């Protein structure tokens, strides 16, 4: 016959070997595929789609869960007050957990790219005022006050003029490896921070509510990517 030598690895079954195997029904002709709208070909498409960011991940009371989808701004607040704050950490526990992006990061080990967060003011039309949205790069600590926050990267948002505004997180990278307890994780450290401050007070005329809500939508930019598949979940098929 033809001379051969079996090499190590012979007979092994590697769960990730993508070889070819004998067809059970060789004559079977699968019904043909037709066109179905909305095919997805790469998860990154979904990652780029904005979903609601539960910045207000505070109430746990079952009947208040819907409140996590929006945070408020009110007349009561005084100019300069810190409104809300959160970090740009898609893969870690927190607000991003509500985003489809955060959820998908959970199926991977490493990732990086730019992010985008859009804030939608849903108060009355008659309501006006200014908010200062600021990004503090990684390492930098939450600004003591509005004043110092203003010295950094920021946007003065006049919800009297425009109802939405989008902030861009230039770069996040979950690559630095850690080996804490005895469980080795691949965590950020690249936690940039987004702080929202009242620049002016909430201004409203007679007859307009004194509290309005902001909805935050977020997604990854086109330069975003993920590596090392990692199946993990608390939600698994039941017995």
Burial status of residue 74 (CB atoms within 10 A of its CB: 0-12, 13-18, 19 or more): middle
- Scanning 3-11, 68-76, 129-137, 215-223 for contacts with a copy of itself by CB under 8 A, the matching segment is 3-11
Helix (H) or strand (E) holding 151: helix 146-151
CB of 3 to a copy of itself, least distance (A): 4
203 binds, among Na ion, other proteins, a copy of itself, none (CB under 5 to 8 A by kind): none
75 binds, among Na ion, other proteins, a copy of itself, none (CB under 5 to 8 A by kind): none
162 binds, among other proteins, Na ion, a copy of itself, none (CB under 5 to 8 A by kind): none
40 binds, among a copy of itself, other proteins, Na ion, none (CB under 5 to 8 A by kind): other proteins
Return the closest-CA partner of residue 222 out of 49, 41, 38. 49
Distance CA 222, CA 51 (A): 16
Number of residues this chain uses to bind Na ion (CB under 5 A): 4
Return the closest-CA partner of residue 56 out of 31, 32, 85. 85
SS3 47: helix
Distance CA 217, CA 213 (A): 13
* Residue 75 or 208 having the CB closest to other proteins: 75
Distance CA 104, CA 51 (A): 12
Query: Which residues within the stretch 19-38 sit at the binding site for Na ion (CB under 5 A)?
Result: 19, 21
In contact, 204 and 77? CB cutoff 8 Å: no
Burial status of residue 43 (CB atoms within 10 A of its CB: 0-12, 13-18, 19 or more): middle
Taking CB under 8 A as the rule, does residue 1 contact a copy of itself? yes
CB of 183 to a copy of itself, least distance (A): 20
Taking CB under 8 A as the rule, does residue 4 contact a copy of itself? yes
CB of 19 to Na ion, least distance (A): 5
Taking CB under 8 A as the rule, does residue 232 contact a copy of itself? no
Query: Which residues are near Na ion by CB under 5 A?
Result: 7, 9, 19, 21
List residues binding a copy of itself (CB under 8 A). 1-14, 16-22, 24-29, 227-229
């Amino acid at each position: 016959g033809f001379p051969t030598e079996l090499k190590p690895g012979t007979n092994q079954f590697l769960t990730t070997d993508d070889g070819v195997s004998a067809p059970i029904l060789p004559n079977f002709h699968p019904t043909p595929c037709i066109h179905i709208p909305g095919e997805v070909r790469n998860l990154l498409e979904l990652c780029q789609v904005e979903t609601i960011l539960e910045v207000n991940n505070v109430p746990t009371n079952a009947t208040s869960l819907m409140e996590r989808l929006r945070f408020p701004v009110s007349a009561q607040a005084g100019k300069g007050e810190l409104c809300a704050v959160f970090r740009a950490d898609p893969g870690r526990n927190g607000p991003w957990q509500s985003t489809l992006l955060g959820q998908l990061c959970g199926y991977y080990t490493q990732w990086s790219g730019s992010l985008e967060v859009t804030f939608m003011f849903t108060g009355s039309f008659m309501a006006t005022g200014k908010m200062l949205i600021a990004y503090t790069p990684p390492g930098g600590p939450l600004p003591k006050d509005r004043a110092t926050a203003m010295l950094g990267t920021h946007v003065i948002w006049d919800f009297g003029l425009q109802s939405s505004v989008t902030l861009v997180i230039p770069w996040i990278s979950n690559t630095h490896y850690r080996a804490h307890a005895r469980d080795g994780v691949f965590d950020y450290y690249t936690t940039g921070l987004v702080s929202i401050w009242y620049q002016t007070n909430y201004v409203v005329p007679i007859g307009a509510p004194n509290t309005a809500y902001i909805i935050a939508l977020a997604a990854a930019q086109k330069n975003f990517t993920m590596k090392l598949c990692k199946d993990a979940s608390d939600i698994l098929q039941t017995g």
